[PDB]
Amino acid sequence: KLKVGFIYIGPPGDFGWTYQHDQARKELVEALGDKVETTFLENVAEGADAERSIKRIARAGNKLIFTTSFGYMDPTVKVAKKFPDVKFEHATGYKTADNMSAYNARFYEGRYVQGVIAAKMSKKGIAGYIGSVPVPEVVQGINSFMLGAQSVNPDFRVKVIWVNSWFDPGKEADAAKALIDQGVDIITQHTDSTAAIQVAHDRGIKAFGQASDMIKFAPDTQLTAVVDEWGPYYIDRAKAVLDGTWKSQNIWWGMKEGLVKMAPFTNMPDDVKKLAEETEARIKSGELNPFTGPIKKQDGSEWLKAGEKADDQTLLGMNFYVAGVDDKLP
């Protein structure tokens, strides 16, 4: 059997980011169980822990290894050099090697839809945003969310609190409570766990799930969620290893390609659901790209001209906010 390994930055118990990775591992086992065997390690920190943990999985005989967090980028590039018969698949990074692929999702496409919904739902026009770490993926998401909201309410605001890691349920909960205490009427996040959405549900504040459909933790208050569909990708790459056709590739895919999808649209009026559907549909067809001008930056300078679509290279290094965001970027 092909031994396939997984490194997670959190626990499957997060019921968000790591959980979606592990549910996709389970999809792999269900589709190719007779020919594949999976192993994982969880709560693996960036840096030395990641290097040792990736090396250990390779030394145990795993011939395809998925490193499922951005901070594993450099550790995966380093370790891959020492294991030429192993194939490595790094999540959300932009670095590849002869035996290392990079798989990224346009999560910001889902953020745009959520922003549209948020601007229709929030009576105050204010959302609480729980940031993880200020890497370009997160800045993209904040910016896209705001642009979506601003296509309904030009005056929409977000209040951002940084947790400073991907998974930290204590700080995620604290951030949600602080944002709700400060008067926001929508909660959203780029951290990994269900901590904030349960706080929001406990306070009757409507929210978006992250990575996974988190409806079970907020049945009457989740509006939708940006859902990461890793399973078909994991199956395809395992098949490619099994049949000997696996080759290094760098990909960045979104709704059109099926890597990102919205959860069902719940707890909102029918016209808001119709508009969410229409928005997702326009992104999925290629008609709507959230980062299409006119768009100005936080400091007032123009970014994109009327009708001008962003280059992906700009997004991948994104380190500025669009006009309307109040946060100072770390």
Ligand X SMILES: Nc1ncnc2[nH]cnc12
Q: Nearest to residue 330, comparing CAs of 142, 204, 174, 192?
A: 142
CB contact at 8 A, 246 and 42: no
Q: In what order do the strands lie in the sheet with 250-253?
A: 36-41, 2-7, 64-67, 87-91, 100-105, 250-253
Distance (Å, whole) CA 320 – CA 299? 9
Q: Is 230 annotated as a binding residue?
A: no
Nearest Cα residue to 68 out of 217, 214, 248, 192 = 192
Which one, 115 or 209, has the nearer CB to Mg ion? 115
Q: Is 17 annotated in some ligand binding site?
A: yes
Q: Which is nearer to ligand X, 17 or 108 (CB)?
A: 17
In angstroms, what is the C-alpha Rg of the chain? 20
Q: Which does 92 bind (CB under 5 to 8 A by kind): ligand X, Mg ion, none?
A: ligand X
Q: How far apart are CA 285 and CA 12, in angstroms?
A: 32
- Asked whether position 286 contacts Mg ion by CB under 5 A, the answer is yes
Question: Rounded to the nearest whole angstrom, what is the least distance from the CB of residue 272 to ligand X in the complex?
Answer: 26
Cβ nearer to ligand X, comparing 71 with 128: 71
43 is a site residue for Mg ion (CB under 5 A): no
CB 113 to Mg ion: min, Å: 14
DSSP state at residue 88: E
Q: Which positions lie near ligand X, rule CB under 6 A?
A: 9, 17, 69-70, 92, 137, 166, 190, 192
Burial environment of residue 97 by CB neighbours within 10 A (0 to 12, 13 to 18, 19 or more) = middle
Of 80, 75, 79, 18, the closest CA to residue 48 belongs to 75
Is residue 250 a contact point for Mg ion (CB under 5 A)? no
Work out how close the CB of 213 gets to Mg ion at its nearest, in angstroms, rounded to a whole number. Answer: 24
Residue 17 binding result from Mg ion, ligand X, none, given CB thresholds of 5 to 8 Å by partner type: ligand X
Sheet containing 206-211: order of strands: 157-162, 126-131, 186-189, 206-211, 222-228, 260-262
For ligand X, the closer of residues 17 and 145 by Cβ is 17
Token pair in block for residue 239? 């098949």
User: Which residues, other chains included, contact 83 with Cβ-Cβ below 8 Å and sequence gap of 6+?
Assistant: 58, 99
Run of H or E including 271: helix 270-285
217 binds, among Mg ion, ligand X, none (CB under 5 to 8 A by kind): none
HSE-CB for 105 with a 13 A CA cutoff = 23
- CB-nearer residue toward Mg ion: 100 or 255: 255
Q: At closest approach, how far in Å is the CB of 259 from ligand X?
A: 13
Q: How far is the CB of 303 from ligand X (least distance, A)?
A: 23
The CB-of-112 to ligand X minimum distance in angstroms stands at: 17
Pick one of 289, 292, 298, 314: the residue that binds Mg ion (CB under 5 A): 289
Binding partner of 286, given ligand X, Mg ion, none, CB within 5-8 angstroms per partner class: Mg ion
With CB cut-offs between 5 and 8 Å by kind, which of Mg ion, ligand X, none does residue 230 bind? none
In this complex, which beta carbon is closest to Mg ion, that of residue 99 or of residue 289? 289
Residue 326, number of CB atoms within 10 A of its CB: 10
Instruction: Tell me which of Mg ion, ligand X, none is bound by residue 233, counting a contact when its beta carbon lies within the kind-specific cut-off of 5 to 8 angstroms.
Output: none
* Smallest distance from ligand X to CB 18, Å: 7
- Is 192 annotated to bind ligand? yes
Nearer to Mg ion, 231 or 254 (CB): 254
Q: Which does residue 70 touch among Mg ion, ligand X, none (CB within 5 to 8 A, set by kind)?
A: ligand X
Known binding-site residue numbers for adenine: 17, 166, 192
Known binding-site residue numbers: 17, 166, 192
Applying CB under 5 A, the residues found at the interface with Mg ion are: 286, 289
